[PDB]
Amino acid sequence: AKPANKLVIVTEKILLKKIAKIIDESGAKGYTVMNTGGKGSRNVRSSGQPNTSDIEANIKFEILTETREMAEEIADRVAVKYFNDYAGIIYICSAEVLYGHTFCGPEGC
Amino acid sequence: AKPANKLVIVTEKILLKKIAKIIDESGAKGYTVMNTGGKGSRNVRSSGQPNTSDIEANIKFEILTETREMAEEIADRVAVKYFNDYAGIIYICSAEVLYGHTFCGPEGC
Amino acid sequence: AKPANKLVIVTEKILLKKIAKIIDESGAKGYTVMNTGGKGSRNVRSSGQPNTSDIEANIKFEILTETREMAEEIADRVAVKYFNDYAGIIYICSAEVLYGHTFCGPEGC
Amino acid sequence: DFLSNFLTDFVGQLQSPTLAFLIGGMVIAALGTQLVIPEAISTIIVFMLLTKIGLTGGMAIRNSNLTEMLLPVAFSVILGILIVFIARFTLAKLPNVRTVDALATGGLFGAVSGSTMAAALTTLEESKISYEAWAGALYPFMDIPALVTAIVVANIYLNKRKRRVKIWPIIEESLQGPALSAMLLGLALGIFTKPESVYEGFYDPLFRGLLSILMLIMGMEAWSRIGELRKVAQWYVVYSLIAPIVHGFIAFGLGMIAHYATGFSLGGVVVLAVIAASSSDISGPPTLRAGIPSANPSAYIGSSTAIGTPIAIGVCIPLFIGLAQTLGAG
Amino acid sequence: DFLSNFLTDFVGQLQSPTLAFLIGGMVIAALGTQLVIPEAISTIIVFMLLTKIGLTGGMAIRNSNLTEMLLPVAFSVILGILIVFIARFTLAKLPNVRTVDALATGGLFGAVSGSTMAAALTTLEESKISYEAWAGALYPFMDIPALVTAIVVANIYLNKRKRRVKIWPIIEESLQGPALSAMLLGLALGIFTKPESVYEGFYDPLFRGLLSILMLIMGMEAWSRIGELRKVAQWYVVYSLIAPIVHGFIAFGLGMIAHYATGFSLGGVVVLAVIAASSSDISGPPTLRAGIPSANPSAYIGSSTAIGTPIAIGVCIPLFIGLAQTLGAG
Amino acid sequence: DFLSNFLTDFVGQLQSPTLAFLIGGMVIAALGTQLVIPEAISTIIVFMLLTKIGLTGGMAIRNSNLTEMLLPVAFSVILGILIVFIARFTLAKLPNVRTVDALATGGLFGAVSGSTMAAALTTLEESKISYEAWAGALYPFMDIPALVTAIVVANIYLNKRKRRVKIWPIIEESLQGPALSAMLLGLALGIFTKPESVYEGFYDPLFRGLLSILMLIMGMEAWSRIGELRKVAQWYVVYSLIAPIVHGFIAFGLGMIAHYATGFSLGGVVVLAVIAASSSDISGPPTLRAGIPSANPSAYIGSSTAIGTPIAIGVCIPLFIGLAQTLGAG
Ligand SMILES: Nc1ncnc2c1ncn2[C@@H]1O[C@H](COP(=O)(O)O)[C@@H](O)[C@H]1O
Ligand SMILES: Nc1ncnc2c1ncn2[C@@H]1O[C@H](COP(=O)(O)O)[C@@H](O)[C@H]1O
Ligand SMILES: Nc1ncnc2c1ncn2[C@@H]1O[C@H](COP(=O)(O)O)[C@@H](O)[C@H]1O
Ligand code: NA
Ligand code: NA
Ligand code: NA
């Protein structure tokens, strides 16, 4: 029962290497990535594979931070750098972490 | 910091074409799809591939709407049309969109 | 409009068989699984496939329970059994189920 | 004789591939293996088998007269409609069988398995029986009128019980399926082009080996659908055991009419009988789910996949091949 | 003559594989098929084709003199730079064409498609024209200086309009791509090792058949990118139709200089012309997206994939092969 | 002599496939390539190699006496138990080595790599040394008693330090693994059936080429596990370099007992030595993770994959093959 903020970044698949660098620079303890599909305004993709077989051409990042101010600092760094040229959405929900060794610490939560 | 509602539809994989049509008819700006697995009551599937290699036979839709009334209007249209015959669950959580061009607009959020 | 708790377990891919057993023992009506990637403290994996092609080596469970006390009882059983030796995080968010036959019942929600 | 010919043809096919990989996949799935064939490999195997069948059926069409393939195309359309009408009057008149479940089951048993059709062509080759090379192009002419008839007749019954359906979108979805589009691609490249160099080097030498992997998949499929068959009735077990044999015997009698009239060879009436004995399994149940959503999917998937496909490969292929050794001895 | 030779070479290649599977994939995608080739199969096919090209180009290098491959390597570097500079002064001087979109389009038309290069080697084999076996190793020497020149020149233009770029990380990303790493692996195993046993058994007999599946993929790719081409200009359609022919004619003239000076064979100047006519498709647009993020990706992906690759396979391959029947008749 | 024979056999195998693709995959992974082989392709390759080994080992069993394969089956069970007991008394008696990590490492070095066993059969073929065709069926008789012994002995040690384990579910999980189920399927189809037509057409001509892709994968695997080896000790590097050679020399001495008693051929004692030198890397670490969860997975995966498999393919295969040229010269 330790309160957290769940930041979600949905963007193009090509930015997997660059956004995982930004998360590791901000002091976040980890992240989770999925390959997803979806539709929006900038729907054209180029992933290095054939587009006709590229049904899931997005990534969904999921970052749990202890503070709200850290999760807005990752989102400000991603959206300034890439969201003028790449497709993307960033939203944040509120969660509570029950277990986890690097989040709650060795003391526990 | 623009408040939103996150509608989630988890259903069978065969309804990928029909549910993405309903979302685009309601005025939602976009959606996100994943291939997922899972267990429930109606566990039998038929996806057009061998069932023994079909470990992820569901879709998870994720739709962010500005209004609560729109997200309930997509859910009422899907559950009346398909949820008498197909497997499915629909839930809704609350989120806040920090960035995104077609959601927040060109003005910003 | 029936309130629920969304429990999320992110752990190693090898525990897919054992954690789905624990969820079915607790009285939860179902779950959802994804294959995900991600980074943390215990990053070494062994899934039975080559690690160089194993880009998504985690599972994300998603369990919707009616009561908060049930979702903490699944999380206490998983984290005591496996989280001393395996990688993992468990968090819980709050949701509202709009449709679903085994969750809301035949009466409706 | 007849049953003297059949039993040594039955153990003769168990002592061969294309049935042993069916049994071998069914045994290791019963023993609970974690061996899976990936879904990307299963998609490219069905593409490779059905393109090869299309390339031969079309390298022979441009030499053909297009009147020899008039009565087998007419008879395979009739067989697709008649099989659904047999299940309407026999299976649906049973105690705990819903009528909308029997019409969906008869629609799958009228449709064709490309896995069973490819297993019949390879057994005809190593039994040294000549067949018309365009006989694989009879596959859409039975598969599509059976799925259309099941959807049309069931939707009439649902409106009768309450007290119109668009036929062409059903034909459009069936033509655009991944199995049947690969054959039609092969048909067009056989007729209008000269694909003999890529056929003799790639699609023909890889046929029998890729089929043995698909025989392993269909059979791990069969064991995984047996649990769906415990939840419907015991009359779907009796239907799935004897209806592949009955539908093959009606097709063999219809094939002997074309043999006496246009010279349709005896190896081609075996292709017509096994095609009518097979039940979809993959491309069918997605079409019948959208067309008949009120049907219980444990009824028709459990009938056609768990029993109907091992019966058509295991029993019906050495039965109708051994029947064509009797006729054709003079 | 010349155009008497071309038209019977055009229908001669439509009556053959490697172009029919290109057209056949384009037709079934226009008819709206649900047939997809999985992404795991498309990755291992590009690996298998480019390893075979690398193994031959390197089993011939260790026998070579390394001065015969001095002017074709010098000319294919110049052609990669010149093609981007042609699109700077012709395509970007048009009314509704952005300059940063034309430099990204010219960077893709300077880069090489490995799918088009493999289609040119197989057509040279069954037209019985000998070529240098290391001519496939000219593929990185045009692909990489074209993508570097497009990123460098566009970043100079963006700083001019506002009122430095690291070149070696662009070369490092291009060398580490999955297509070009498979060829360099094959080059190294050809030179330093003796891979003749696995080459004659696996990589060579599976070449023409795996290419026909890749020809099916590239062509379902072409139809899916036509809708991106309605959103840019009508001058990208005129550019993508005639610039593969013009870039091939400049490369053919540069290849005839090497033919008269070092004995570079006429089958090798066809390889040099088709490589300069091809446009990248898969490995290029991810490099130009990171390098030039301000470019509209509907402009250069829609130009190079929807038109530029069917023109290079359909028109440019039987044009420059039929041109090398005229020269070489004495 | 002995070391005169070995060094020209060492460069003789580097100038050949099956080791060059191991080195070639290790070099391009060190240079940081983005080339990946998809997981669907890696699953069907292990299926194709182990089914072929099972089909030969079983087309020879039904001709065999079942007393020639009594002492090699007895000796390969003993070697699986003895290797884990060697690591208990040598590796675990070192300063910064945990005892529960050494028992998990010795369990992987007792288990067998099917990638290394397939590399030893192909090198014996092109060195023209005859071996017993059922020697591939010794693979479960060493793999399973080694993983059972590591789990049983480590769980005894954890209860000793605190102050019972079910053996048959460990054997049930190992028999149901995707690698070992493919071989047992091939064994059963070799004995009870006649699979010679699909074997000579599909599984045998595709063996050496599919192995060269698996040699590329194992080797990109080796470079990705070197970073796990910096976090344990420097004694896992010394163990992983010399224990594949020591376990092969104990197996070669045990194989020479069977050669002098039942006529077990000298090509079969090379198969017994390389199987005893290989470490699992694929099916092993998931079994030892569930059985011994308290072990550090960087210790035994980093030891067996980064060093132990390149040593067994690179050093141990040309050592024990060249040893069997010395014995067998009269
Ligand atoms: N309203 C929305 N709800 C959910 N996901 C969205 C929404 N808008 C955009 N996305 C996701 O964000 C990606 C990029 O959005 P866009 O910038 O509109 O192209 C899309 O492909 C979707 O995956
Ligand atoms: N309580 C639950 N929690 C999470 N996911 C569920 C739950 N119930 C159902 N699902 C998902 O919804 C699908 C269909 O549910 P059902 O209608 O029960 O078959 C399942 O396969 C799961 O993916
Ligand atoms: N702060 C975090 N935010 C999101 N996901 C996380 C976080 N920490 C850990 N994870 C996930 O949990 C897995 C195991 O975490 P760990 O126990 O740190 O290895 C990681 O591989 C991630 O998928
Ligand atoms: Na049928
Ligand atoms: Na070019
Ligand atoms: Na061993």
The first and second tokens of residue F21, run together, are: 């693709």
CA atoms of F217 and F36, how far apart (whole Å): 9
Measured between alpha carbons, how far apart are the two ends of chain E, in Å?
Answer: 15
Number of structural domains (chain A) is: 1
CA atoms of E30 and E40, how far apart (whole Å): 24
Query: Is D286–B46 a contact, with Cβ atoms under 8 angstroms apart?
Result: yes
What is the DSSP secondary structure assignment for residue A39, as one 8-state letter?
A: E
- Per-position DSSP letters for chain B, written without gaps between them: -EEEEEEEEEEEGGGHHHHHHHHHHTT---EEEEEEEEE-S------SS-GGG-S--EEEEEEEESSHHHHHHHHHHHHHHHTTTS-EEEEEEEEEEEEEHHHH-SS--
Q: Give the closest residue (by CA) to ligand 1 atom 5.
A: B31
Residue A40 Cβ < 6 Å to ligand 1 = yes
Q: How far is CA E237 from the centre of its chain?
A: 19
List, in sequence order, every residue forming a beta bridge with C88; answer none if it has no partner.
C11
The first and second tokens of residue F20, run together, are: 């060059």
Element (H, E) at A90: strand A88-100
How close F154 comes to chain E (CA, Å)? Answer: 40
C-beta of residue F290 within 8 angstroms of C-beta of residue F104: no
What is the DSSP secondary structure assignment for residue D278, as one 8-state letter?
A: -
Query: Is E33–D176 a contact, with Cβ atoms under 8 angstroms apart?
Result: yes
List the chains bordering chain C where 3 or more Cβ pairs fall under 8 Å. A, B, F
Query: Is C30–B39 a contact, with Cβ atoms under 8 angstroms apart?
Result: yes
C-beta of residue A74 within 8 angstroms of C-beta of residue A18: no
Residue C15 Cβ < 6 Å to ligand 3 = no
Residue of E164, E129, E105, E93 whose CA lies nearest to E320: E129
The first and second tokens of residue D138, run together, are: 């009879």
Tell me the C-alpha to C-alpha distance, in Å, between residue F162 and each of F101, F155, F158, F159: 17, 11, 6, 5
Could you give the domains of chain E?
3-326 (1.20.1530.20)
Amino acid code (one letter) for E242: I
What resolution, expressed in A, was reported for this entry? 2.7
Mutate to test the pocket of ligand 3, among A31, A60, A101 (most ligand atoms within 8 A of CB): A31
How close A89 comes to chain C (CA, Å)? Answer: 19
The first and second tokens of residue D19, run together, are: 């049935």
Length of chain C: 109
Query: Is A93–C93 a contact, with Cβ atoms under 8 angstroms apart?
Result: yes
CA atoms of A60 and A90, how far apart (whole Å): 10
Alpha helices, DSSP H only, in chain E? 3-14, 20-30, 39-59, 71-89, 99-110, 114-126, 139-162, 168-175, 178-192, 196-198, 207-224, 235-259, 266-277, 285-291, 297-303, 309-311, 317-326
Contacts with D217 from chain B: Cβ below 8 Å? 50, 52-53
A27 touches chain C (CB under 8 A): no
Residue B87 Cβ < 6 Å to ligand 2 = yes
Residue B9 Cβ < 6 Å to ligand 2 = no
Residue of D108, D136, D149, D142 whose CA lies nearest to D50: D136
The first and second tokens of residue E297, run together, are: 């990706």
From which experimental method does this structure derive?
Answer: cryo-EM
Give the chain E residue whose CA is nearest to the CA of F17. E195
* CB neighbour list of residue E163: distance below 8 Å, 6 or more residues apart: none
List, in sequence order, every residue forming a beta bridge with C34; answer none if it has no partner.
C60
What is the DSSP secondary structure assignment for residue F67, as one 8-state letter?
A: S
SS3 D293: coil
Question: Between B14, B52, B53, which is nearest D286 by CB?
Answer: B14
CA atoms of F162 and F151, how far apart (whole Å): 17
A70 touches chain B (CB under 8 A): no
C-beta of residue A47 within 8 angstroms of C-beta of residue A13: yes
* CB half-sphere exposure, D125, CA atoms < 13 A: 13
- Optimal mutation site among C31, C99, C102, C104, interface B, most CBs of chain B within 10 A: C99
Residue B68 Cβ < 6 Å to ligand 1 = no
Q: Which ligand is nearest to the CA of F120?
A: 6
CA atoms of F248 and F241, how far apart (whole Å): 12
Question: Between E16, E33, E210, which is nearest D181 by CB?
Answer: E33
* CB neighbour list of residue D17: distance below 8 Å, 6 or more residues apart: D208, D212, D215, F189, F193, F195, F197, F198
List the chains bordering chain D where 3 or more Cβ pairs fall under 8 Å. B, E, F
Give the chain E residue whose CA is nearest to the CA of F207. E202
The first and second tokens of residue A28, run together, are: 């976040």
CA atoms of B27 and B33, how far apart (whole Å): 17
C-beta of residue E190 within 8 angstroms of C-beta of residue E62: yes
Query: Is D298–B86 a contact, with Cβ atoms under 8 angstroms apart?
Result: no
Mutate to test the pocket of ligand 3, among C56, C82, C89 (most ligand atoms within 8 A of CB): C89
Pairing of the two strands C31-39 and A31-39: antiparallel
Q: Which ligand is nearest to the CA of A39?
A: 1
- Optimal mutation site among A9, A91, A96, interface B, most CBs of chain B within 10 A: A91
Residue A4 Cβ < 6 Å to ligand 3 = no
* CB neighbour list of residue A21: distance below 8 Å, 6 or more residues apart: none
Residue-number span of the structural domain to which B73 is assigned: 1-109
Three-state secondary structure along chain C?
CEEEEEEEEEEEHHHHHHHHHHHHHCCCCCEEEEEEEEECCCCCCCCCCCHHHCCCCEEEEEEEECCHHHHHHHHHHHHHHHCCCCCEEEEEEEEEEEEEHHHHCCCCC
C-beta of residue B9 within 8 angstroms of C-beta of residue B71: no
Query: Is B52–D221 a contact, with Cβ atoms under 8 angstroms apart?
Result: yes
Query: Is F14–E201 a contact, with Cβ atoms under 8 angstroms apart?
Result: no
C-beta of residue E39 within 8 angstroms of C-beta of residue A49: yes
Ligand 2: nearest atom to the Cα of C64? 3
C-beta of residue E116 within 8 angstroms of C-beta of residue E49: no
CA atoms of F39 and E44, how far apart (whole Å): 11
Give the chain A residue whose CA is nearest to the CA of E284. A48
Residue B105 Cβ < 6 Å to ligand 2 = no
